[PDB]
Design a protein around this ligand. Sequence first.
Ligand code: FDA
Ligand code: FDA
Ligand code: FDA
Ligand code: 2H5
Ligand code: 2H5
Lengths: 576, 576, 90, 90
Amino acid sequence: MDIKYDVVIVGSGPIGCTYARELVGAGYKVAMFDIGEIDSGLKIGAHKKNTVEYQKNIDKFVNVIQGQLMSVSVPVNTLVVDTLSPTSWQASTFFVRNGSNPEQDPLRNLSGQAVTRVVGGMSTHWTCATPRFDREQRPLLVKDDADADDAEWDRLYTKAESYFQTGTDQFKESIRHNLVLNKLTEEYKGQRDFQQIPLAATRRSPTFVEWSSANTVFDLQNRPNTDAPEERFNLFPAVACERVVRNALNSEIESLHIHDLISGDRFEIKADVYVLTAGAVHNTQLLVNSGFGQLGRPNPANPPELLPSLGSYITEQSLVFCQTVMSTELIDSVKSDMTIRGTPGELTYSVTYTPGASTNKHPDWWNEKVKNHMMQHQEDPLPIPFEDPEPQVTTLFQPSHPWHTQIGRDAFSYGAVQQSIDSRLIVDWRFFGRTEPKEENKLWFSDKITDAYNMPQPTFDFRFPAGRTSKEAEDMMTDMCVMSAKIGGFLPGSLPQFMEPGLVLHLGGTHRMGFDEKEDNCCVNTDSRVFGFKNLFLGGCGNIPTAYGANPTLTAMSLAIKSCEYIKQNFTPSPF
Amino acid sequence: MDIKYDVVIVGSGPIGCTYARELVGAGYKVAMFDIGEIDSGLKIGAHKKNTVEYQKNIDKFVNVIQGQLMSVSVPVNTLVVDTLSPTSWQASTFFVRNGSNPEQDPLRNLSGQAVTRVVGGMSTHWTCATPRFDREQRPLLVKDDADADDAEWDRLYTKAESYFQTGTDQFKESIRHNLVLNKLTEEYKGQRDFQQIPLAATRRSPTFVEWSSANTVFDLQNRPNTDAPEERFNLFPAVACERVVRNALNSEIESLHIHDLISGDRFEIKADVYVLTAGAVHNTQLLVNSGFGQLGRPNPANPPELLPSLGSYITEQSLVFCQTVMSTELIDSVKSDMTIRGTPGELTYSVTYTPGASTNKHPDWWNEKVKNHMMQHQEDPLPIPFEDPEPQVTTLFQPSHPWHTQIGRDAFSYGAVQQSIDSRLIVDWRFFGRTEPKEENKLWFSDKITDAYNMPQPTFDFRFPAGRTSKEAEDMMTDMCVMSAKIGGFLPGSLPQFMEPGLVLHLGGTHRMGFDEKEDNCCVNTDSRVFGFKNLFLGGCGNIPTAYGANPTLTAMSLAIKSCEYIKQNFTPSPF
Amino acid sequence: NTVEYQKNIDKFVNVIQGQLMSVSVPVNTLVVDTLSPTSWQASTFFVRNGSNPEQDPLRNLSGQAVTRVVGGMSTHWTCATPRFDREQRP
Amino acid sequence: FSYGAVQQSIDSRLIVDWRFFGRTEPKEENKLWFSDKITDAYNMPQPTFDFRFPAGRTSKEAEDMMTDMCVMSAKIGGFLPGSLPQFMEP
Ligand SMILES: *Cc1cc2c(cc1C)Nc1c([nH]c(=O)[nH]c1=O)N2C[C@H](O)[C@H](O)[C@H](O)COP(=O)(O)OP(=O)(O)OC[C@H]1O[C@@H](n2cnc3c(N)ncnc32)[C@H](O)[C@@H]1O
Ligand SMILES: *Cc1cc2c(cc1C)Nc1c([nH]c(=O)[nH]c1=O)N2C[C@H](O)[C@H](O)[C@H](O)COP(=O)(O)OP(=O)(O)OC[C@H]1O[C@@H](n2cnc3c(N)ncnc32)[C@H](O)[C@@H]1O
Ligand SMILES: *Cc1cc2c(cc1C)Nc1c([nH]c(=O)[nH]c1=O)N2C[C@H](O)[C@H](O)[C@H](O)COP(=O)(O)OP(=O)(O)OC[C@H]1O[C@@H](n2cnc3c(N)ncnc32)[C@H](O)[C@@H]1O
Ligand SMILES: OC[C@H]1O[C@@H](O)[C@H](O)[C@@H](F)[C@H]1O
Ligand SMILES: OC[C@H]1O[C@@H](O)[C@H](O)[C@@H](F)[C@H]1O
């Protein structure tokens, strides 16, 4: 560890890795600090799903996800357990216990919000969906010139797509995927377009997909090294960043205060530039601990010195979910091109098709896979092959259906895992709604209660706004119900429902971007630079100030990229 | 990867690693293959609990366990789902779905049995309890000489204990541990002895314990390296070992057939010596796939060629579990020595005690902790400090209480963890019963059905033997109820119950050891060598042939140590 | 038609439950494998608690039930009495 | 006739129940028959069902019916957790 770096980046998620790739790339002397530790194997911060065992036993990966999601804010528990033995110790009140947050109102929480503290951050477990926002979801990076704004977005997005290895081809040969995609297309012809979810992933084999992660962006190995002898990068894991120190004029950051979690030591690190990419919640906490915004319960009569909007206008998307069991009609359509004769399990049984026939509803590869499955597994009642990959279908946000949709099998399942109905039949439905930014919706931090890292406890004051937000949300529920009945009926146990506020984990706007601090009620400009401050930059979902439905990580990468352009224009790397 | 080595080891668990430590160190060119991958972080095969994040969020670790425990044998599901939509595809029969085993009788299963395919095996998640077996649980290593037998076992156990870094003082200054230890000691004074569970762990700081793992035994780093310039070791993860090739004469293994899961290729690796430490079930699978024992549903009418005892006489322990909520008396007794002034929360509150008074019921280290907790947390109604370690208490197996006890807090919780009752009040109780070895209790492998690695499906035919085993399992149950009541009443949601057979993962006897193949109905001798074969060695709990109550891993490591002496005497390493 | 039920409408479900007897219940095959080893334990799923061995669990009307009291099901019914239109009417 | 534990967290003044009942085509294959071996609680022949909702119209209307409840109910309110849209036991 040095005293002095060109850039210091807080957090090693896919956004801090975008800063590193770009800046380590341009020859800056870079350090990265993460509170969490390396635990994805030898590929530092790689996706935990990239092991043969997980992709053979995909129902188990939910436990990984759960094991690294720590709830942000848990109100104090008021369940009545009144069947204790009379000898057992009991309290006469519902006291603060098991780490609960007494500031938190149970009825205005994002009870589902959680954070992850591991190198690679949430990108070690995430679903890899990386859609672009269209104009209506997207921040303006140029006022008054929609084409120049368009041009700038597309250039950033294409570059961001290349860091993540985003593609829309990795599921093209799944029967199940094409079954669903084709029926949805047919049933909505013209009115909605369907496609593969764009995914940051590469297919290694029919049974294996290399899911992208922060490691894909930048491999997080220390440099110089044989492969980049001219580059300078050090990752320090198990290091909690506590505070940035402001100069008296509030125009410059002067140091980063850290705590080595293993040695217990505390340091002050000097850099030319300080980049904070610790998550939409922990960026906020870091700032507030450093005198930005306002510690404690919001009070308007006490107007904050720096960044009045910090932690206001927060957005989290609505989520509705269900699972369906494929219709008989759809399962029978899988074998539509086949001539089936005799009795399965007997030597006279056959199943054949006519290759090339233009009246075949399916291409030859489909019919070959069905034929083989049906002939080698005569004991199974379904035409679907056993290792068939899941669907990954989307119809993207449009003004007429202003929500995002994911139709397939997500590794993050919500209940006990059903065993009675065959998996091949089951389709997941997830519709994500956009939420209006409102000043009243807040993340703020206790001045008295602290977290497990002795930082100020985050606390939420949130309700989905009335008006458009609530109307679209129930219109979204209805849409899911309508659309999903095209594929089949609901799975008992996975009936249509809203999920817990924040389980979806696309929290935005906690440190939101705008052209004008005051006019646009915001904390960073369109270079992601904190207003006032020459050398402090925020990355991540916290920056997005608009109401969006799609998954945000791509877009936040795109912003980080344009942040790094600004850095390169204003700060000179130290000579190697 | 070479075509030839001196030794090849299958499986990177702690037995695998025991063989590696011995033979690498003695200069043999060794290669170890594991079907699972390095995930655990930069210390290969290290314990997953060893992160700052899991030791602050100890209730999350159950998610890591569940995440890498894959059920061995699931019978065909017969749950009725009769609220499907009538458009949905409906089964006419209870067909084979979701990887289930149609061979398995659901009424004679070890349904909680599971396996783990990661480098380091189950020692990446285990609880690290490492007691010795007493005579009554232990197999004889010397005939007709009880004291020679004890001496050899003491020699081996001492060595194993150094390898694992077993200790009995890691929890010596925990109030909870000592609170429970003292009450039990007193209530059974002169009748039973209570001590800390022997743990493979090293305490690093008051809030952090470095749990031991396979990594502790052997660091799995390829050699030579700087720390070891004349050793030769290579670890090949993501390689499925599928068969050991017997010579036609049945006296020698000629090669190991492997499947590299990443490239998809197959190879044949030669060695001088072959060691199987794939785990009790999978050592048995791999042998049965290579021609030992009998493939398919057992048939007396046809005799196995080789190792007719293979997969018979299997033992699994009964397990009874509950949780308790600490008595008012015991909680009150925690602050017995304190003098308290004023009223909590004001500048007037004072809590003090007198170091060394022999009115004091507790020591100084205890009172100082309570004091500091009560002064710094005056809102809190409990005098137990917040970061106080869990109890880790046992009374070891004896003739009048022939069961193992662990009392404290296990990471392997078996219901959703309640948040209503303060965690500091809860104590777990687990009593482990011994099971008589019987020929009829069996692990066998199907000749048609395969598992996800395309190996023969494992199937159990098991029932806890009537007579002593059943009588004791019920007596155990009762003792747990009687004992636990001295500490407090039951926690609702964790009432006294038997766990699902096999849930304890202490399976043994599947490839069991003895002096003679026939008289002792066994598969390996006391050098762990397979009868008939010069150069095939088995390690693990499957070797243990007796009825045991306590955690088997140290005993199985002991065996491997003895096995390595033989190997060292009877095979010469290739030149460097 | 008691004042007590009309003031505690939530409780009336129990009256209904009290008098609906299942017509045909298949033989149960739920696995309970956490019995004490000393407890008497089935080797098969045999005909238990008045179940019907003739009944295919997968081609049942499991919710079907009968009431045996004077007044029959009219002692508990919801009292909804619509006419059928032609489409539904013999 | 409520179907689970009566939830108590939500003011019952707010709660509206939706039930939509579909029609079923008569098919000779759908039968109630009686065992000549097994007998019920009063020593009469045990009733047994062989029943599946017919494919075709009965099925298509069932699922169209379920959508119509979703679509209609949403005019009045969102679903009450624990009483989400479901088909009930036949
Ligand atoms: C968990 C999850 C996440 C997402 C998906 C599903 C699941 C279950 N799927 C999904 C996601 N996003 C999408 O775009 N598409 C998908 O299909 N998920 C969200 C995605 O995972 C996140 O948006 C993305 O990682 C955010 O990137 P980031 O801004 O780089 O933030 P991270 O949270 O990943 O990591 C920040 C990081 O910093 C650390 N940290 C926290 N506090 C400190 C302090 N004080 N000092 C130093 N370091 C700090 C972390 O430990 C962490 O690594
Ligand atoms: C899961 C668990 C286990 C234990 C405790 C708690 C819980 C939650 N507690 C514990 C236990 N043991 C004790 O002695 N003390 C207690 O506190 N647990 C059990 C203990 O973990 C095991 O007994 C021990 O690891 C067994 O060691 P081993 O014989 O070396 O077995 P492993 O299962 O650890 O690893 C073998 C291994 O080989 C692989 N494998 C399997 N098949 C193949 C094939 N065909 N080719 C190559 N490799 C293969 C695996 O991937 C695995 O790593
Ligand atoms: C239980 C129930 C029933 C109805 C509603 C609510 C619920 C929970 N709601 C509903 C009703 N139908 C409507 O049209 N609209 C509504 O809002 N329910 C159904 C209605 O309750 C029935 O259709 C009606 O009672 C049928 O009348 P029934 O043809 O007269 O038949 P019952 O079952 O009422 O009475 C028959 C009766 O005969 C007896 N019995 C049975 N076996 C024997 C033998 N072997 N010997 C002599 N007597 C026998 C009974 O004990 C009973 O009293
Ligand atoms: O709850 C799971 C969901 O969580 C969001 O973060 C993801 O973007 C979706 F892909 C989906 O996996
Ligand atoms: O089921 C929980 C138990 O699991 C066994 O494998 C362990 O040996 C016990 F220490 C305890 O952790």
